[PDB]
Ligand binder design. Structure first.
Ligand code: HEM
Ligand SMILES: CC(=O)[C@H]1CC[C@H]2[C@@H]3CCC4=CC(=O)CC[C@]4(C)[C@H]3CC[C@]12C
Length: 462
């Protein structure tokens, strides 16, 4: 079982020595992120490894990265690594490929313009208020609060309302069937037995498609499909993603009906647990660095006096806030990696890359690389002080990727998280208990998350 295993020794590329059938996956005991640093540390600029039989080429040079992510994105590095039995979700933009990806992407971009984002701020700012009362209510009771729980509820509230115009406080209405289903849409752990099996036996993926076994829980997708077509149905009696999409069905185009339901499902999958994880990582950093939390609270109260409500304009005004957000994303880029399938023999910047190879950018590692980042391990928001910008390479730092296929939901996710932080920090402060793990521990699994969940105390500023 060493078919594609000769490739990198042939081209003269360095790397860890692959076992038959398994390749290098046994090196994943430490998790993706620490496998990526070790390889960087030990082979340097470039290296090669095998996910089962699948050869993966890591690159860390910013010029090489740009060529891949930007310059030719369209005729060579268009698609992501196929990853599992996927059924109708093959039409979701993050999963679609080549020409149909390109069609969806430009059908869906107008939905993410800045105009639309502003129509949406009074809708998401509403759940900023909701989150606050939920927070005071169980902070004036004492004591430890689980962030992932309060920020998950907030992330859900904001998705349900901007995706579908469904307005519920999910923390307190925990069983609207709409809360129950959408909550099951978590990010995939690719070190789970199921995905490691799939990686070693990818010839099994088609078999699973046949039995209609899918990585998106068929019971949840059923629910949303029936939900959506009913929403479209009883709407022929503003503003939300569903609506913007229903409109771009009225004149590549003819954004399909089922194509629409797929995008709706995938927007949830993309924004729900991502947004809640980052908010947790940030609020963890703010509790462990009162320096920074105090400075932010002071910045907020100068832009928004008398606990005044955040607007779009006052949000972009706050550059210490922006500093904290980015410095958190550096330390914890929850994507971990960026990947493109190389779909033709190509020659980029002097390195020959044979057709079929997965080219991989180790985002977690580059964000912690001693060259570009002084004291890489410490939470230092001053890195992003507008002084030191332009000392920041947009290809080293890539928490939302880069190029035509970057995070289409970026400015939304950024605006979402900031409005949440502001409303929270206008009202509360967050101290570390010692149910709190200090310092933080990342998971040995395939998701960038804390080992044990983050718990803190929440004091009302009154
Ligand atoms: C803090 C929250 C988020 C982070 C850190 C994040 C990060 C990322 C990253 C790294 C990628 C891959 C980009 C690449 O391959 O270069 C991505 C893709 C994507 N994200 Fe986000 N994301 C977040 C939230 C969201 C939200 C809220 C949405 C939608 C509402 C969203 C929708 C997408 C979509 C649709 C793609 C694939 C786009 C395509 O393939 O054309 N993400 N995200
Ligand atoms: C947590 C996670 O990544 C999810 C995504 C796809 C999910 C799997 C999908 C297929 C599946 C079918 C089963 O009957 C057992 C559970 C499993 C094996 C699921 C376990 C949890 C997985 C691995």
């Amino acid at each position: 079982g060493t078919h594609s295993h000769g490739l990198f020794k042939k081209l003269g590329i360095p790397g860890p020595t692959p076992l038959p059938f398994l390749g290098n996956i046994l090196s994943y005991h430490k998790g993706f992120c620490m496998f990526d640093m070790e390889c960087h540390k030990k082979y340097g600029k470039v290296w090669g490894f095998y996910d089962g039989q699948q050869p993966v080429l890591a690159i860390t040079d910013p010029d090489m990265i740009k060529t891949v992510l930007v310059k030719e994105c369209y005729s060579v590095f268009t698609n992501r690594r196929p990853f599992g039995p996927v059924g109708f979700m093959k039409s979701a933009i993050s999963i679609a490929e080549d020409e149909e990806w390109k069609r969806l992407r430009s059908l869906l971009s107008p939905t993410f313009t800045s105009g639309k984002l502003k129509e949406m701020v009074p809708i998401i700012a509403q759940y900023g208020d909701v989150l606050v009362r939920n927070l005071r209510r169980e902070a004036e009771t004492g004591k430890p609060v689980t962030l992932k729980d309060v920020f998950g509820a907030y992330s859900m509230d904001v998705i349900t309302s901007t995706s579908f115009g469904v307005n519920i406080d999910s923390l307190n209405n925990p069983q609207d069937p709409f809360v129950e289903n959408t909550k099951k849409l978590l990010r995939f752990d690719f070190l789970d037995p199921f995905f490691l099996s799939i990686t070693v036996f990818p010839f099994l993926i088609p078999i699973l498609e046949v039995l209609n076994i899918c990585v998106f829980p068929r019971e949840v997708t059923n629910f949303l499909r029936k939900s959506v077509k009913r929403m479209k149905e009883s709407r022929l009696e503003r503003v939300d993603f569903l609506q913007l999409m229903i409109d771009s069905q009225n004149s590549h185009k003819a954004l399909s009906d089922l194509e629409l339901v797929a995008q709706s499902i995938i927007f949830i999958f993309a924004g729900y647990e991502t947004t809640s994880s980052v908010l947790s990582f940030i609020m963890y950093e703010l509790a462990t660095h009162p320096d920074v939390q105090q400075k932010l609270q002071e910045e907020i109260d100068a832009v928004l006096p008398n606990k005044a409500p955040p607007t779009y304009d006052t949000v972009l005004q706050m550059e210490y806030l922006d500093m904290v957000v980015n410095e958190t994303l550096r330390l914890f880029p929850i994507a971990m990696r960026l990947e493109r399938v190389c779909k033709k023999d190509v020659e980029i910047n002097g390195m020959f890359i044979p057709k079929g190879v997965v080219v991989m950018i180790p985002s977690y590692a580059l964000h912690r690389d001693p060259k570009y980042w002084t004291e890489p391990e410490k939470f230092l928001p001053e890195r992003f002080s507008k002084k030191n910008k332009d000392n920041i390479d947009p290809y080293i730092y890539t928490p939302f990727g880069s190029g035509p296929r970057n995070c289409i939901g970026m400015r939304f996710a950024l605006m979402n998280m900031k409005l949440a932080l502001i409303r929270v920090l206008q009202n509360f402060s967050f101290k570390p208990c010692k149910e709190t793990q200090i310092p933080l521990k990342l998971s040995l699994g395939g998701l960038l998350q804390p080992e044990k969940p983050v718990v803190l105390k929440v004091e009302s500023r009154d």
